[PDB]
Design a protein around this nucleic acid. Structure first.
Ligand SMILES: [K+]
Ligand SMILES: [Mg+2]
Ligand SMILES: [Mg+2]
Ligand SMILES: [Mg+2]
Length: 155
RNA sequence: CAUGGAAGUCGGAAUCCGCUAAGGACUGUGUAACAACUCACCUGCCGAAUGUACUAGCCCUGAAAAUGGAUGGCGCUCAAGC
């Protein structure tokens, strides 16, 4: 009746995976699972979505482990950026993440599907649209103006 | 975005909606980071006022000299003062 030892852990604060070893002795000690397996699993999961931690969730399954992604709107907005983030430059201005605000971001918002009520996606789409206030949407248009000016369709 | 580590509170730069009557992509304590405690903010109780800045009357502070001492003296307090 081990029940696979359901344990949930979070891995973030990084860029483009990295395959870092250990760094989670507390996670490893719980469930008698090898930390290297979880680190390798998390690195593989984050390899697909580079330059964005996306808050990977690690689930302990007996001696094995499982990887899960959050599909966060902010993580997707981080992915929708200007090209890739080169190394040896993250200490400098990392503002080079400006992309167009269009239906691609609108569809990417549908992953949440209004988890916190939001009265369906009517307020969820506008809220996820306004989430990209750092890049100010595309050109002179702004996420604040896009969300405030209610003229587009609901979906 | 920074990252052995920063989950609001090393550090650089903006400020969204669902939920309500109601909570910040945060004031402060705090963790390596969480957390907790908050706090802002809202709500139970209560039953009539409350806050800030100014104006000018009396009184008080500012107000230290040489023999013992002078509202003329005694004394006077809802005055025997203004
Ligand atoms: K007289
Ligand atoms: Mg005399
Ligand atoms: Mg007389
Ligand atoms: Mg008189």
């Amino acid at each position: 009746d081990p029940n696979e030892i359901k344990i949930i852990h979070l891995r973030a604060t990084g860029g483009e995976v990295g395959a870092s070893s250990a760094l989670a002795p507390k996670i490893g000690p719980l469930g008698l699972s090898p930390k290297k397996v979880g680190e390798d699993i998390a690195k593989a999961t984050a390899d697909w979505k580079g330059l964005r931690v996306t808050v990977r969730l690690t689930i302990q399954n007996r001696q094995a482990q499982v990887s899960v992604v959050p599909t966060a709107s902010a993580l997707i907005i981080r992915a929708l950026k200007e090209p890739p983030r080169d190394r040896k430059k993250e200490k400098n201005i990392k503002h080079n993440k400006s992309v167009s605000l269009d239906e691609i971001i609108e569809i990417a918002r549908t992953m949440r599907f209004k988890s916190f009520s939001k009265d369906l996606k009517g307020g969820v789409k506008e809220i996820l649209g306004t989430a990209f206030s750092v890049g100010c949407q595309v050109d002179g248009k702004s996420p604040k103006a896009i969300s405030d000016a209610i003229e587009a369709g609901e979906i």
